[PDB]
């Protein structure tokens with residue numbers, strides 16, 4: 285547990301990544317980094333995790349990523365990869381086993397076009413956590429419903445349980461983290477008019493990879509309380 | 524010339540794309556669509572062009588792209604691909620010849636990470652064309668200089684003339700359209716403190732593909748005057 289404690293301002297710069305492993309600079313409750321971690325687990329990629337204290341960042345972390353954001357991958361050759369969707373594509377291409385993206389160019393384009401249908405949602409979740417009263421919350425639920433309707437149409441047309449087909453694939457892992465957070469944000473009723481999307485969330489929670497990385501609502505709550513109190517201890521909630 | 528006239532509200536829906544060709548729904552002065560057209564030319568892909576009147580769009584165009592935006596690719600099989608970066612990647616993968624993206628996963632990730640360094644620029648160009656006085660223009664030039672410094676660092680580190688190496692590649696074509704438009708927006712002085720980026724623009728203009736698709740400043744001006752006058756005739760400037 286204590287192994288997972290974040291590195292913050294003053295921490296020593298970490299040593300090289302061992303041959304045979306890849307390193308992720310992550311934060312345990314960051315949904316962007318959770319994308320990368322789902323791919324690492326889904327493909328069985330040996331890796332180590334460094335958690336960054338995103339309230340109290342080490343100055344050395346800007347040498348990993350000039351933007352100072354997670355996720356970041358670093359390999360034994362010293363190559364650095366950042367931006368969540370880019371880290372996922374890299375892992376899918378660089379490592380053996382189950383291809384999470386289709387080989388077919390059109391079917392891969394389709395997965396990126398769905399990602400684009402989804403692209404407003406992270407900004408709404410970012411706005412949501414700030415909402416202050418029942419009126420802002422009503423408005424926020426209607427904004428989620430309009431984005432969710434777009435995703436419902438994809439499942440309607442394909443009649444597959446997942447966005448890439450009847451098997452879970454990269455697009456499902458790239459959107460999952462924000463759906464994971466919906467219960468805890470009390471935004472669960474925004475899937476009520478999207479029945480295929482509501483079944484999709486149940487299917488996802490049964491996925492071995494999703495289940496293995498799922499955080500309890502309790503744990504996500506304890507985090508958000510500290511993040512919103514502006515606490516340097518938020519990222520190390522529970523230890 | 525008259526062949527290039529846009530299809531607008533009331534136009535007939537077009538027929539199927541012939542086997543052996545791909546169709547681009549474009550607009551002659553749209554820098555996002557220009558990305559797709561540079562890739563089509565660079566790879567020697569036989570294609571047809573339908574220009575959309577983006578002030579006076581055909582209702583049938585929403586059947587091509589629910590977002591109602593160009594560019595859109597449509598092939599003989601009836602598959603539809605939209606979002607500029609996605610159309611480019613698709614063409615690079617689906618068609619033979621010169622790979623504009625590297626095969627190496629890391630080097631491909633590097634091209635996407637540069638694209639991300641560039642990602643503020645289209646929004647600034649969108650804000651720029653609206654600027655109203657010498658004060659807004661001073662402020663706008665400093666915003667361009669801060670983004671251009673990020674791109675200068677990539678060329679500094681690589682000591683290559685192009686963003687992907689010493690040969691022009693996909694990343695150069697994906698960013699070029701906004702640099703093409705800088706003279707006409709009177710934002711040419713924003714490359715003065717970025718000497719490697721200023722040489723990069725000269726190298727680009729010598730590229731056979733870039734040169735073949737370059738629009739005169741006169742032509743871009745006539746367009747922007749009508750776009751800003753809110754004219755349904757903007758997209759068909761000069762015919």
Ligand SMILES: *CC(=O)Nc1ccc(Cl)c(S(=O)(=O)NC(C)C)c1
Nearest residue numbers: 311313314315316317354409410413
């Ligand atoms: C890594 C990470 O937590 N990134 C991040 C960036 C912006 C936003 Cl909005 C989020 S969040 O959707 O979890 N909301 C909070 C503001 C952190 C996460």
Ligand SMILES: *CC(=O)Nc1ccc(Cl)c(S(=O)(=O)NC(C)C)c1
Nearest residue numbers: 550552553554555556593648649652
């Ligand atoms: C296709 C096209 O012209 N797209 C587009 C979208 C937004 C913006 Cl801002 C532009 S522009 O940068 O050329 N500026 C004008 C507002 C059209 C283009």
